[PDB]
Amino acid sequence: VKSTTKTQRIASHSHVKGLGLDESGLAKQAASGLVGQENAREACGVIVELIKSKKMAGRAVLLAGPPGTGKTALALAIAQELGSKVPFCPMVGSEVYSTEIKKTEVLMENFRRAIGLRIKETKEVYEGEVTELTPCHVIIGLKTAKGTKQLKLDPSIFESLQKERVEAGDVIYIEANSGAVKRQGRCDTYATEFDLEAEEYVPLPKGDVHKKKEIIQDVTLHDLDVANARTDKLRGEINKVVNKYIDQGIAELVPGVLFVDEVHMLDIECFTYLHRALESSIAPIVIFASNRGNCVIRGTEDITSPHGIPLDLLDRVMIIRTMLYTPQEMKQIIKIRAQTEGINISEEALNHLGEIGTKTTLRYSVQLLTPANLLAKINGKDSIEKEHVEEISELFYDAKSSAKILADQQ
């Protein structure tokens, strides 16, 4: 079915591809698009190992740190480290307070988004090593064990292949029955020292170009929810079918990571639901994140407990701190984000952006990039200079600065 994921939520940290740790366990300065704080990264690796050892029975992770210190980045890194396709469901605690739907529905939906389903369906794929892409259309040669097998990939599937950024000398399979193209990687013939076997330089396929390959379909329970909806009855129906598929041996359940930011905004009832659900075996992780200390648990406006979580759940939570970062790490972070977004920026501009992030936050500094490059585009330049960053800083403000500006007069 369709990938029903709020890409905008995780769109800010698509450069992170994993936790980036050594075999020993330590974390390097920068790896897999993760720079800066390392102790929390080692703790996240420990949590991943605990998951793989099946020791995370009814426990959770709570990431305590100031805003803009990589909490969501660390959760995404954990999700990546458990697998490339492992579901990740980032959420805020204030979104349960809906005006039409119940907090039960919102919490159930966010739980369902966080459980993956590996359905393997044997389908005839066009696995081959792309040789040429002559649109005469578009006839493409597919080198395989038999050899180059030229087939006309229709302009539509050719544009989908371009959406896969597929070039010559690349071993991929093109779903013919579904009319889709997906990048497996390049060919091992060009594997350099950084390119190894059975990786983003995959070897030449050994077999017929059209091979029935079990397509591992990564779909979440809520991804299957939208289809039938096009209701409680619908909920149960999919559950039984998925269960049966699991028993048969074609569907493998993969619990994901459910990240809840601003945990202090959940009521006592929501915490009870979270505890009840995470008590179950299938339940994914619940990675909390708190921007404050001791707060009064909402609903009971007399009792204050650490991080706003009730004691029954706090005693069953593993706490990981995060560091506030420094200008050099923040500048490296901005460099990575700019490379991901495709913006050329001067070093002095990077230093100014880093100091701005230290003043207000990393979120603001990251968000300032697009407007600055875009102002430079207006000016007719491709590179961002210091004056552009200064102008954008004096044009748009951050929440605290604006509030003070008003208070200065108020």
């Binding site: 979104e95 307070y97 039409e100 921007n291 979120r363 403000y397 108020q410």
Partner: protein, 386 residues
Amino acid sequence: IGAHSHIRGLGLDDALEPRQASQGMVGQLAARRAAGVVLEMIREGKIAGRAVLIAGQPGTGKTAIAMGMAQALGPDTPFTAIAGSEIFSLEMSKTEALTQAFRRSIGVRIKEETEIIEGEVVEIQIVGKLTLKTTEMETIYDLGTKMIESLTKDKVQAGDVITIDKATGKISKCPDGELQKRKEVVHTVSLHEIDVINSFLALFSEIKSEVREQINAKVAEWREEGKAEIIPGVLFIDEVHMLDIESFSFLNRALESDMAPVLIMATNRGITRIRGTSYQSPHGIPIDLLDRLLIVSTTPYSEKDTKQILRIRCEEEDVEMSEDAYTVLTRIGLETSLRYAIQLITAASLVCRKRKGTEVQVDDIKRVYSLFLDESRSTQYMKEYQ
């Protein structure tokens, strides 16, 4: 209705360089530059999943900048200005109020063939005829007494674009082509307009959901066929601090859709407790929404810009003012709100007409100032009583 109907754009020239006085906007160069950046960001389509909130003290043109941006996006782009307190209404729940506010901003430009009775008036023929010339031919197109009266209302005899059996419009004397310009007028009808159409003292003595679903289906069909053109507009929510956490969550949900219009909010509090919950936050907005917010701050007004604004407004209200009267009104608008200053104008006009004058003097301005109290004076005077 009415209010600030004098701005037809941001007036920031090109390359985000506000040219001071232009299409209304006569100040707030920083805010104008930011609004232009936001507008061209919207054009290039990288504002998805974002919003704009304009902070500033009352009477600094927060709504004017939003109206200018709406005009700059397109000549017929929908603009919907509501207030935060506007949602806690007796008939509709906040859900329905915000849904209506959103659908008010989603405009549909649907073509509609019409036989505009047009022609470059060569002679103003008086019920009777009226010679009209076009590239198609020239003939004495007949009009009514009121149609010719409106033709004289417009500049004579430039034009005129007389829509079929309807009013005219001044162009030049030169609308040409066919005497039957069978032009499919692209009417911009907001989703809410269609919804109300499908559904005269009704306000003195809310639409189910089936009408809504039918409206959505029909609009989608027309847009897909190529007859309609869904053009998201701009939704302005003044007094955003009045909104509570539950409505903020619905706003967050609605910003996720593909049809979501550009959301602009205005606030003037800072560090105010969220209406829902008991947690203080800037401008009373939950941080989940504040993180992805493009903040624009409107600076307070100076004397010369205030006087220019008043000049424009009197030009709009057909009132002639003495220069001393203009200076006194400017000083009042600096000591009090601009809105009170504008209110003063209409009352001064009637005060002038009472003495059968043609131009209002300073005496009328002071008489009306003594007549109607403003916000600050009334309170001060009331509390002192208590």
